[PDB]
Design a protein around this ligand. Structure first.
Ligand SMILES: Cc1ncc(C[n+]2csc(CCOP(=O)(O)OP(=O)(O)O)c2C)c(N)n1
Ligand SMILES: Cc1ncc(C[n+]2csc(CCOP(=O)(O)OP(=O)(O)O)c2C)c(N)n1
Ligand SMILES: Cc1ncc(C[n+]2csc(CCOP(=O)(O)OP(=O)(O)O)c2C)c(N)n1
Ligand SMILES: [Mg+2]
Ligand SMILES: [Mg+2]
Ligand SMILES: [Mg+2]
Lengths: 569, 569, 563
């Protein structure tokens, strides 16, 4: 039979294992919506293309698989640009399918046409391309999927002109290729692997740090077997934290940020094995505050430019992170036993403890709910059956202090782009993936950031996605207000106050359950109750603004744990 | 004294006459917020960068002046991309100021950095540039303003690296240039002008069509004097419609779409004077449906590629539209004796009438409020003291039928990009400009499109902007649903229903006045009352979905006014 | 009948008035070569795409019309990039037609395909676009031509996929549009024009400076009538110099660089009317060395960002330069009352004189032929019947000192890009245009720069283009060597010597007439003889390296006329 170009798209996605799409309808892509309808492939349709974009990101990250976003020509594409950029930075594998104007109508000042969408996306994608012929669709879709999924993972843009999608062709005349692309990543040269293990055995206080590429491959069995065998404690940036959840307690270092205080306590690591973590925002750049200059660093990353980017390293390996973990588990399952490391792991715990307890002791909820105390209420409920997504500024910095000591099913935080607002879309897509794994999704966001995508409460009710949305409400763009006060002056605060709005009332108006709470008592009760029902909820938590999370000070070169501190201004 | 780079920005803006900015705070652009604070330049801060972007568009269009938008690095910029694209298409003069990462921190995988923001904006701006030195700021800002304001007007992107803004400089060591750029546009060669007037005198049924460039220059006095002298009826696309408001009734043709039916009534124009209207979506492309092939066309546009783009023309002039209008008023005040044209203007009116009355007769509100009847309620209140902004799909197509016969102060509709959602931001900025002119702003949007920027109700309350928001609510993405039914089949509707949500309840939760109405009685009453108070309001109007506006059919090559019609698909 | 897409291209070009193309063949564009063959439209085929590119630039500038370049997919396009960039900077109207891979074969790692040619050209063109359908060809070609010819003039790239050109369609089913685009540019608002004239009358020592846009419009009659009426002296950057050739001697200021010394002699202009000249390399940037800070400046340019770019100005007008000249001629033929200015014009001449005579007196050919003396030999032959093209570094700086006082038919020099090597292609295309106007073309280039395109001697012989090529040979990349020795040190010279090669012997080997000369006697004789025959020639002129032209020192902030 004759079939549309939109039909060729969907047949090809199906063959690649895609089971959900995220998008927002337009006539230019209707052929694709119609094919999905015929094939029972759900499309999670949102109220903003950005939210669809971020949802496909969230589905990808929470599910360790390909996310797919689908947007129409013109405004559709331009509204998807923030998700694309965020995926590029975060190394998230998303295929963005966009419509564009018909090639037949090129340069007619017509509806939604006239944007060079590929030129716009080229600098924020692994690959961006416009399809010139209907027969090409299946190979170019499959090619795009291979680009997205190979290491380092990333976003890909495929532009599908309206006429190219509406054109019909004989199904007997075009092949739909399979997805033939090894799931097992490339391993290191054995010589390099041996050299790494030689260094690791010789080392006195070694640590491992995991990045995004370790979550994408999700090689949990190999990882736990490798750590079980060597005894080495493991830390991670935010993307890598859920990979620590299946490790024996005594070797979970938690978030890499805890390494801060080690130098001051004469316990700086002398070896660091970086598995797909990068020198950048989460690892203290080239400063040495987390990853010491004096330490022998072994870095594994699929992108050779990332190796020793900001610091000298002892050994640099271009390989897949997953394949590397696998190879380490192999090499390690057969050789002599490894040195003890029990004393070193006890140290790591003890320091994570001191940090936590120092914050606990400093935090009061006497006059208003302290953000730390609010974050602790959430942690009580974080097991393997929960995915936590984090947005906001101060909100997530506070939340980060409770996360090292619990074992989340998933944990999705900001990446280098720090784009406020992305959390809602992200969490929605995470929740889609999580229903399939029987997990529950919780978004912890700030009163500012929730504003960006607050329409998606509609989408939760319509699609019966039981996401819980917790709003740490400090009546402000909090982090930026703090900058204004600290970096400029007491009364130079301007454009950062949000002294208005009933966010639970908004959610109620869209049909979600709305709670407003202001204390530890009331918040625990409300969260328990929302977790008990399989319904979407919004909990508006009134929270203090003044308190300064330690990571605020650290990310501008000040010691939050000393007595005094110089302001670099 | 020493002053920041952000300070140089603001001093330069001030000197160009800018009195408001639209934006959303980030640390990377705080220097600019601080300078505005010192100089009492208000920044209208929104809940989404897109809304700020569109608000500067709206301020520009409603005010016939430069709009300025201000966004931070990374996500700030990516969230502004849809406004930039829309400005490019609509020929709207907006200066977009964006932060970016410090040049000192280039390539350190740091916070919000690493997006080639200029590369992304190059293909949708008149000019995009990244400032390399603090001393350059004033000349490059002024240069950007000149680029934006010269014909054809358009958006400009100026990227200001964080370190460049924070750097301090002796004020005595850098000059702030004036804005030296003639406000009077260039005129046509007199030979060409004479040839145009020769043709216009010779012609039997001439018309004038105005585009966006005629609103930007706003030469209302010259225009009315030229029309007074020649007797020629004047039509306009959406951007040009407010320029007809000061003309004698007998010569207001209204929206250019009314030309549709003229051919069928043996009254096709034999001359068309296109002043900055373009061959494209609003003028029936190259089809000849509105601007006949047989007619002698005289086209004036500042962009030479636009001339006879899709059709042959008799005479093509590259000049400013405003200067051309001025020149015509001159030439025409001299000779001053022109043929009658009363019969022809009566015809034009009569046909506009027939159209209107045919729709009136076809429209029933017996079982649910018909969108035409809803649009008529709004028209009762459209005088020179109102700016109407329009968003949605079906919603604005219906509204277009009542607009020709009233005289709005401003009227801001979609352009070629047809980007749903832009109206809220647009209207907000329009309202800022309109307080200065004592005008009231009304947004007419669809239940889908309001979702995109629904957070900006917060902004209305915080900033006490008394915008009225009317939501034509048909429980759906209406236009796309119609496509699905018409172009594909009865029960191929999918991803276009929005059978949920209390939008007035949302507005109430943000502190705006909320009304829900479902009849002509109740809606008139609610609008009167919201117009009487100087407060922001949201009126949720329940409205029928089935009715098909004539422009739906016309924009896909079908006759809504015949009896039968062939489906092109 | 059925016709190819290449045929639609050529029919459309014809209708726009195009009479020559410059290019180099490939299978991807053969359809266009075949159509040109049928319609007797010559294609000047070169040995390098760059030379074709520059030749279309040269044809455009010398002829004041559209130049058209034609290159194949892949390497064809990448080789044309330098011409495109140069046209963008110099505001030269060129349409670049490039092939690319078939849309049917997109992403098959096939022959010459896989370069995003539009992305590459976007940042150096007025417009760059890839044609998606054969029916679109005539409107998009014509649209591109309108883009190129409207102010400010510039290059346009139109990418034509192989399958799109080979496709056939019914000729009756697509319209070839006319070129409907006013030749008369837009004029200033009269209020602005009156304000300008008010200023010009009030001024005590006014001058006019012409840029490229004045050559493109070539409104010589209006210009001469405006100057005749106001008495104001006129200067120009290199592109504008040929527009001074038809003015009365007493009002020719010559090259704008002569304004240097006026401040020192207490005679700095107090008003400057900039017609399409820009603040930049040729006008002393924002320094005030040429266009004084104390002067009231009136700037006219079609590009509003150019107005007061580097300096404050009194009045800024966005309009076509040609239309503005026309409008000034009109306003000025009415009122008819203007102040004398004879004393001021005498001053201008007298300062141009002092400069020239100071160089003359300083220049010796005792031990080897001095470049100034070589430039003087050339000037003897520069009348309205000659186009001079200039390449090289030191070579053109020296040559510039003899050009103000002669009246060339055309004069084509470097622009802001200063791209060495472009002169050969440029001059070749200039010569094509000039045969039609009965003018002779002379290229004055350096021994370095001639190397870039030396294959085009083949093209001269094959196409019987009687271009004369003069090589100022100082055995070196001269200007850069000077930098090395003066900015860094006596014996830090490295990578700048070219102590090898018989360039006249090369030309002989390609069939051109070759001369080698080393004195004033021998050079005059050789140039006379080459100008007497209607044959292509190469004169290799041995010339001194040490002498420092004044503009070398000026372009790095030093006074060559002090102490
Ligand atoms: C898209 C975007 N806009 C603005 C910023 C700048 N920014 C950094 S933190 C912050 C405040 C967010 O406030 P909120 O979400 O309420 O959480 P809180 O700071 O109070 O924890 C802002 C605006 C950004 N990073 N991204
Ligand atoms: C940003 C964007 N997304 C999607 C579309 C496709 N589209 C065109 S009309 C329309 C429906 C708008 O519905 P609504 O705003 O409720 O107005 P209605 O047609 O129902 O009156 C859509 C989604 C678009 N043009 N732009
Ligand atoms: C394409 C290019 N490459 C290099 C340069 C740098 N450059 C400036 S002047 C010059 C020397 C030119 O030598 P020549 O043509 O012999 O003239 P001369 O200065 O010796 O008279 C060079 C190489 C340039 N401007 N363009
Ligand atoms: Mg907050
Ligand atoms: Mg709707
Ligand atoms: Mg040399």
């Amino acid at each position: 039979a004759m079939i549309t170009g939109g039909e060729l798209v969907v047949r090809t996605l199906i063959k690649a294992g895609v089971e959900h799409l995220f998008g927002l309808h337009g006539i230019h892509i209707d052929t694709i919506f119609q094919a999905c309808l015929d094939h029972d492939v759900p499309i999670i349709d949102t109220r903003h293309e950005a939210a669809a974009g971020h949802a496909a990101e969230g589905y990808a990250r929470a599910g360790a698989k390909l996310g797919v976003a689908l947007v129409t020509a013109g405004g559709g594409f331009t509204n998807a640009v923030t998700p694309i950029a965020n995926a590029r930075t975060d190394r998230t594998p998303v295929l963005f399918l966009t419509g564009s104007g018909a090639l037949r109508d090129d340069e007619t000042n017509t509806l939604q046409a006239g944007i060079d969408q590929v030129a716009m996306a080229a600098p924020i994608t692994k690959w961006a391309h416009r399809v010139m012929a209907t027969e090409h669709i299946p190979r170019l879709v499959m090619q795009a999927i291979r680009a997205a999924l190979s290491a380092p993972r990333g976003p890909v843009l495929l532009d599908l002109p309206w006429d190219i999608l509406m054109n019909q062709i004989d199904e007997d005349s075009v092949i739909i290729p399979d997805l033939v692309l090894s799931a097992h990543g490339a391993h290191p040269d054995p010589a390099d692997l041996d050299q790494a293990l030689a260094l690791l055995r010789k080392a006195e206080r070694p640590v491992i740090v995991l990045g995004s590429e370790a979550s994408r491959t999700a090689r949990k069995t190999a990882l736990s077997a490798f750590v079980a065998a060597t005894g080495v404690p493991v830390f991670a940036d935010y993307e890598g934290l859920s990979m620590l959840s299946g490790l024996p307690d005594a070797m979970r270092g938690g978030l890499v940020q805890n390494l801060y205080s080690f130098a001051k306590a004469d316990a700086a690591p002398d070896l660091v094995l970086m598995l797909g973590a990068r020198f950048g925002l989460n690892t203290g750049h080239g400063s040495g505050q987390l990853i010491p200059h004096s330490a022998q660093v072994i870095q594994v990353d699929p992108d050779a430019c990332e190796l020793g980017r900001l610091q000298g390293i002892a050994l640099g390996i271009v390989a897949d992170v997953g394949g590397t973990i696998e190879a380490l588990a192999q090499a390690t399952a057969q050789d002599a036993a490894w040195p003890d490391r029990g004393d070193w792991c006890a140290k790591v715990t003890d320091l994570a403890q001191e940090r936590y307890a120092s914050i606990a002791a400093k935090s009061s909820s006497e006059h208003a709910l302290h953000p730390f105390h609010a974050s602790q209420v959430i942690a009580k409920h974080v097991d393997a059956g929960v995915t936590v997504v984090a947005d906001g500024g101060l909100t997530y910095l506070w939340l980060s202090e409770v996360m090292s000591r619990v074992k989340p099913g998933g944990f999705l935080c900001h990446g280098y782009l720090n784009s406020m607002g992305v959390g809602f879309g992200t969490a929605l897509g995470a929740q889609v993936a999580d229903l399939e794994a029987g997990r529950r999704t919780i978004l912890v966001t700030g009163d500012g950031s929730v504003g960006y995508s607050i329409g998606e409460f509609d989408t939760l009710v319509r699609k019966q996605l039981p996401l819980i949305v917790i709003i740490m409400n400090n009546q402000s763009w909090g982090w930026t207000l703090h900058f204004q006060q600290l970096a400029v002056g007491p009364n130079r605060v301007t454009g950062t106050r949000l002294e208005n709005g009933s966010y639970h009332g908004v959610a109620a108006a869209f049909g979600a359950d709305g709670y407003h709470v202001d204390s530890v008592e009331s918040f625990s009760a409300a969260l328990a109750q929302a977790l008990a029902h399989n319904r979407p909820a919004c909990i508006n938590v009134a929270v203090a603004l003044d308190p300064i999370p330690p990571e605020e000070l650290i990310l501008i070169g000040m010691d939050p744990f000393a007595g005094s501190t110089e302001n670099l201004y």
